[PDB]
Amino acid sequence: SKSTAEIRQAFLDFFHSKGHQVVASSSLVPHNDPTLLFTNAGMNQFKDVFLGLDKRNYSRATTSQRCVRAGGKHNDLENVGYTARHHTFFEMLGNFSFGDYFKLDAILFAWLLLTSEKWFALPKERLWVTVYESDDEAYEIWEKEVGIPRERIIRIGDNKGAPYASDNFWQMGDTGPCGPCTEIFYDHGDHIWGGPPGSPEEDGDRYIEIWNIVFMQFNRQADGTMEPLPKPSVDTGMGLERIAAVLQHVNSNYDIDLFRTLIQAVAKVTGATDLSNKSLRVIADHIRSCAFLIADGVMPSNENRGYVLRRIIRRAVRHGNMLGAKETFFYKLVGPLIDVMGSAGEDLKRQQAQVEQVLKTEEEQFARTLERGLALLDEELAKLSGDTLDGETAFRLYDTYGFPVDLTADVCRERNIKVDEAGFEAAMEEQRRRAREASGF
Ligand SMILES: Nc1ncnc2c1ncn2[C@@H]1O[C@H](COP(=O)(O)OP(=O)(O)CP(=O)(O)O)[C@@H](O)[C@H]1O
Ligand SMILES: [Mg+2]
Ligand SMILES: [Mg+2]
Ligand SMILES: [Mg+2]
Ligand SMILES: [Mg+2]
Structure with missing residues (x-):
């Protein structure tokens, strides 16, 4: 058709x-x-x-x-x-x-x-x-x-x-x-x-x-x-x-020609053998939002637009780990993405190298703590009584391992575990005022 x-x-x-x-x-x-x-x-x-x-x-x-x-x-x-x-x-x-x-x-x-x-x-x-x-x-x-x-x-x-x-x-x-x-x-x-x-x-x-x-x-x-x-x-x-x-x-939107080709590209760089699963579709979607945001001038950071970009990148890298990615993979999807977008992906191709480097750098940075962070989450879930991960653990995964709270919640969701996001923001605020107390400003 x-x-x-x-x-x-x-x-x-x-x-x-x-x-x-x-x-x-x-x-x-x-x-x-x-x-x-x-x-x-x-x-x-x-x-x-x-x-x-x-x-x-x-x-x-x-x-x-x-x-x-x-x-x-x-x-x-x-x-x-x-x-x-x-x-x-x-x-x-x-x-x-x-x-x-x-x-x-x-x-x-x-x-x-x-x-x-x-x-x-x-x-x-x-x-x-x-x-x-x-x-x-x-x-x-x-x-x-x-x-x-x-x-x-x-x-x-x-x-x-x-x-x-x-x-x-x-x-x-x-x-x-x-x-x-x-x-x-x-x-x-x-x-x-x-x-x-x-x-x-x-x-x-x-x-x-x-x-x-x-x-x-x-x-x-x-x-x-x-x-x-x-x-x-x-x-x-x-x-x-x-x-x-x-x-x-x-x-499904993910069964259209564009996402079929894109999901195939994700499977190639991650080594995934499934035709389709959550991770494959998430990564295919995430590369579109991440690559185009950077092409439009958004740079990864810890606040505002940059942090939303950072959250999406790191959630995609997490799903790559789920699929069994052995090496840096996310930036390798920019090329394939440009190809499927056609005329709508020309603002992106214009800065392919730049977008690729930003994603490469960001994934490598997060890869330092990702697996050790996933191991900590797994040992905390193994001893969790109830259906909700506490705020301290979510704060720890954030403070030490750079896990956004929604990324932690994404993992826990796949196992029917909720996240105390109120306890997370409370632990977040408590650190902010420690910085205010110590710094004086
Ligand atoms: N997150 C999303 N992903 C893909 N397409 C979307 C989308 N949000 C909106 N659209 C598309 O954009 C069109 C206009 O945007 P609109 O704000 O009406 O979305 P919507 O929120 O009403 C769709 P829904 O009610 O299913 O969330 C919709 O008809 C829908 O096809
Ligand atoms: Mg509607
Ligand atoms: Mg509507
Ligand atoms: Mg609607
Ligand atoms: Mg809607």
Whole structure:
């Protein structure tokens, strides 16, 4: 069928033929807003255009934005390797309307691309749509204009437990452009556990959310106030990996051509013999987030963006150890990654050597203490009464061996053991004030 690269280009070509300006992906590092750790959506670089503070020569655009959702806000790190649909690094295919077309055309564009014989040509029967409970306009558009059976049109209100807090109300953050949205789901088959959106089993991998179409209408204020945007606008986002899985007739993102080739590369450098397991998929995902973050200027450190990068690198190195890696391996995956990304991996190839050295240095540094740290964790788990590793042990693995608390928790999770992360932060704070007491500052 179609490769991931062909699907990415087809999406861009579709909207380009619909008068959309093709705009390059922005960096993973936000422009002078932290606050946000990482670019997590395609609309980020158009934020001020939605607010009406900035205007473009074009009124409609389309992008394939690289996103990282490993802190915040959206943090999907603990889903990586457990679900069929979650990555840290992923490309969000988006079309944008800046005071141009609104709900009807946005919905028609998406449906045409998905179901048309000229385009993706997906069977209408396997597509479910959600709307915001109060969004009657979106409901009637799906029902009367598109012709979706009412059975597969699901109203969702404030299911997160506060007003405007909803799976069908997309918000950028505590402030910024937002509005009710309509989301398109794909039924992967009854052989997979899961229910439709709204069911107690909606988290299953059967009904996977493919495309989120946001009808930008409000600028959310600090005080929780919704202030109307000057011009109603559209912000859409479709996971390239998720739509690629659908189009390549597989349930999992890790079964698409890109991740198949990438997982094969991981197995080659680690010596893994399994077709697929948690570690293989985690490392394949982690190299994408680590390599692209460094290419975008993020350097490993013990604070802020750098520490998130450091956490991901070291968790990937841990999984390499699980697979039985004998030598430094992580940096050897940059080449293979560049090859599978195509045009989306050109900002990376530009600095291959630099990214490779950073990852090599980082792994070698962590390798000093990794195995001795894993041995300590194993002897502490062997004498652990209860289901929770204490904070002192987690602090020790951090202070001496450089184990991030979530890395320690990742290992313990695989054995049904929890981590007292409150006791860890307490032990962390106690060290901070010892430094304050001793230093005087
Ligand atoms: N961690 C992740 N990995 C891969 N794709 C993701 C992702 N988070 C979001 N996407 C994709 O980006 C699109 C728009 O982003 P959005 O913020 O709506 O995600 P989401 O959080 O609603 C998906 P879910 O509800 O399954 O977590 C989604 O339709 C989804 O396909
Ligand atoms: Mg989510
Ligand atoms: Mg959702
Ligand atoms: Mg969702
Ligand atoms: Mg969503």
